[PDB]
Amino acid sequence: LHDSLCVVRNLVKDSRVVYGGGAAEVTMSLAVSEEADKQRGIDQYAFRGFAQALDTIPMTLAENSGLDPI
Amino acid sequence: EKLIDIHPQTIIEGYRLASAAALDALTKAAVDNSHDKTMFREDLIHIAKTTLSSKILSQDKDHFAELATNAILRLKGSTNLEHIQIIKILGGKLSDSFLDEG
């Protein structure tokens, strides 16, 4: 409940709602990735790191169900 | 390991088939010849050198690369490396290590 409740005071503290199912996470893999190509330097691989990263939420989310993370 | 996040026993299939493609291309890029004893000696030294480098004895790299390519020459191809024995004595300095024909 302290979850269900707090979730609502999240809406009170800052009204807005994204989309779950790792969906919110997936966006970064795309968006952030583009802002790395046109970034050049060494911050292209570091930022590409946030592509390598957010992929976990959907991966474990889905793998925890038995579906192929790939 | 990272890839394992995804079945393993299949990953072996790739590394044995894909690194086989690599194994293949590496043969293509290879450079054969020559087979003239005139040219050989000049390659064998280059090999002995590249190998003898990075080893305490690199200092006089040539001195050794010569030692090697010689003993290898005697006994055509391909003979066991058991007749040419590497004996060693504690004698002042380095590079006093010659090859002996007896």
From Swiss-Prot, chain A:
Transmembrane segments: none
Its biological purpose: Molecular chaperone; assists the folding of proteins upon ATP hydrolysis. Known to play a role, in vitro, in the folding of actin and tubulin. In yeast may play a role in mitotic spindle formation.
Shown residues in whole-protein numbering: 423 to 492 of 562
Disulfide bond annotation, renumbered to this chain: none
UniProt subunit comment: Heterooligomeric complex of about 850 to 900 kDa that forms two stacked rings, 12 to 16 nm in diameter.
Annotated family: Belongs to the TCP-1 chaperonin family.
Localisation per UniProt entry: Cytoplasm
Protein name according to UniProt: T-complex protein 1 subunit epsilon
From Swiss-Prot, chain B:
Cellular location(s): Cytoplasm
Source species, domain of life: Eukaryota
Function: Molecular chaperone; assists the folding of proteins upon ATP hydrolysis. Known to play a role, in vitro, in the folding of actin and tubulin. In yeast may play a role in mitotic spindle formation.
Family: Belongs to the TCP-1 chaperonin family.
Quaternary context: Heterooligomeric complex of about 850 to 900 kDa that forms two stacked rings, 12 to 16 nm in diameter. Interacts with PLP2; this interaction leads to inhibition of CCT complex mediated actin folding.
Name of protein: T-complex protein 1 subunit beta
Organism: Saccharomyces cerevisiae (strain ATCC 204508 / S288c) (Baker's yeast)
Shown residues in whole-protein numbering: 107 to 211 of 527
